């Protein structure tokens, strides 16, 4: 019943005889399945998750230099040194400055200088290696029970592709899903930047000129290639300057245009995955196929409304007393349109039922219940121009 209202919806019907029915599930797409004397079911891919992801390398895209420290020596007094030169969180550089009387030296000449600053990462992106088989999918199966828009969650993986799922009152449904997504995780790296994510070529990833931490480094601070975001300036032999090179965030986004983008709605992998499944409905059964026909009268609780796919939704309440019972439903004298919410049943007189049916093109008659007060509603499904 979940599909009712979703524009990206498919109505897949099982080939007259054959138990199997092939469907394609993707994010923001719903699928309605029908088969002769079988319940109508609604499928939706709710989440895709990359499990057991091995971090290959982590890159710095925005950095900050702090704790700047300098040491100089007087001319001929050798090379200066700071302890920081041995601290791997620090970026250092040796240069020469003009020394003399006015800057604290007995002699006039080129005195060695050394400038150290603490390289701190403000923003990073991590590249993850994901094993195709480790991609978990979450499918929700909702039966067409007439009850408000109840659903059995089911998890599959390209390995555990085939699962039997039991639906309370309808029996079991066998699902055989394919390891055939539009995703070659082989030689691809899942590049994650905050809330954005993409799938990119391994060699391109490793060849990026940015400071990095290896996959192995357990939340380290010893960024390799710090030089790629740091610059030392000493043009007049008066002073050495250390300067940060500015956020590569937007630059990265631009580099990543001709890449497979992955979206992250509510901080999860909710894109580029599509699952081609096969469905066996031989163990499925219509709920209340044993119940008797409704005798009483029906009321129209909400005005009949048309869905985006030409189908119509009728919310009705039972006034009679036979419940639990089968609702008599039909769409002059000869049958015309088809039912989507197959074998509509009443559970309680108080609880209304939602019946989805496909009316025929043009004028039709929606007849709900049996006499007296048997509802004889009118529909108009006009034809469409190019």
């Amino acid at each position: 019943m979940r599909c009712i209202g979703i524009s990206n919806r498919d109505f897949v019907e099982g080939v007259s005889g054959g138990s199997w029915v092939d469907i394609v599930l993707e994010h923001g797409s719903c699928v309605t399945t029908m088969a002769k004397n079988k319940p109508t079911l609604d499928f939706e891919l709710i989440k895709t998750e990359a499990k057991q992801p091995a971090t290959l390398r982590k890159y710095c895209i925005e950095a900050k230099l702090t704790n700047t420290t300098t040491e100089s020596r007087c001319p001929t007094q050798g090379e200066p040194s700071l302890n920081e030169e041995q601290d791997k969180r620090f970026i250092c550089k040796h240069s020469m400055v003009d020394r003399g009387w006015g800057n604290g030296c007995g002699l006039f000449g080129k005195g060695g200088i050394v400038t150290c600053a603490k390289f701190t990462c403000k923003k990073n992106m991590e590249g993850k290696i994901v094993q195709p088989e480790n991609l978990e999918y979450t499918i929700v199966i909702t039966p067409h029970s007439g009850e408000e828009h109840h659903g059995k969650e089911i998890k599959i993986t390209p390995q555990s592709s085939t699962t039997e799922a039991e639906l309370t009152g309808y029996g079991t449904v066998t699902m055989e899903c394919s390891p055939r997504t539009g995703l070659d995780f082989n030689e691809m790296v899942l590049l994650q930047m905050e809330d954005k994510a993409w799938l990119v070529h391994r060699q391109w990833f490793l060849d990026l000129p940015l400071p990095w931490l290896p996959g192995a480094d357990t939340q380290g601070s010893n960024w390799i290639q710090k030089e790629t975001l740091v610059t030392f300036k000493n043009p007049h032999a008066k002073k050495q300057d250390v300067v940060v090179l500015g956020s590569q965030e937007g630059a990265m986004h631009t580099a990543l245009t001709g890449a497979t983008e992955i979206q992250m709605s509510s901080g999860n992998l909710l894109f580029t995955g599509h699952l081609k499944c096969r469905l066996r409905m031989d163990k499925l059964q219509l709920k209340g196929m044993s119940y008797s026909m409704c005798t009483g009268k029906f009321k129209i609780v909400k005005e009949i409304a048309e869905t985006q796919h030409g189908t119509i939704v009728i919310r009705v309440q039972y006034e009679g007393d036979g419940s639990p019972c089968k609702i008599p439903f039909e769409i002059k004298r000869h049958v015309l349109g088809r039912l989507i919410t197959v074998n509509p049943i009443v559970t309680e007189k108080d609880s209304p039922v939602n019946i989805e049916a496909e009316p025929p093109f043009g004028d039709s008659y929606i007849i709900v219940g049996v006499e007296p007060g048997q509802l004889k509603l009118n529909w108009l499904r006009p034809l469409e121009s190019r």
Partner: antibody
Amino acid sequence: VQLVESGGGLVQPGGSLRLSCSASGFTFSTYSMHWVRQAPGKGLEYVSAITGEGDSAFYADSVKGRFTISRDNSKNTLYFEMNSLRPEDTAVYYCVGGYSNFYYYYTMDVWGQGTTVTVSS
Amino acid sequence: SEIVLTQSPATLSLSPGERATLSCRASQSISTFLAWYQHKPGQAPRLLIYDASTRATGVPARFSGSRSGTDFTLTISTLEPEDFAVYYCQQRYNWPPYTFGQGTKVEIKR
């Protein structure tokens, strides 16, 4: 399933205040959260709302400009950082929440106990 | 345009055991998106009915809701002493504001 509000108190006119609403017993991110107030002897006034994800916010003209709704899904807390307080904002402020699948829309809700805000000199 | 909900009567004086009928009028069609609340002083407002006719979880059956275009009705069949409160209607049509009615007070007739 509950909502606990706090931060109510006496404030001087032109003054400012921040209200909190701590959510428990549910996935806070799945609920559109709302602020409803009731001035003494007056009815319920729907004042503001925020999406489950914090993305988008709504404010009734009566508060639009001075009041800012916000939320922390890590800390399961809704806030009504209310600045530029006037005597007419004196009321019991309730937070309400409902499972939302589309922006601010909801069916069944959850209400907190209320917090009194007094704006007086 | 702005949706206004109009509640009538302002005060409803009845005896326990009687049938109470409360009306709420929308300024334009709000379809079926109407909710009813029970408000007791020194208590948080309580949701009774949503979608004009659906009883909330645990709400007793004496509470009934019905629609007729822009005119909505809250019915309480056998009034019990704890049903003596203030009743509000609320619109949940489309987009906010999800505004309220001015309220109806259900008082004991003596």
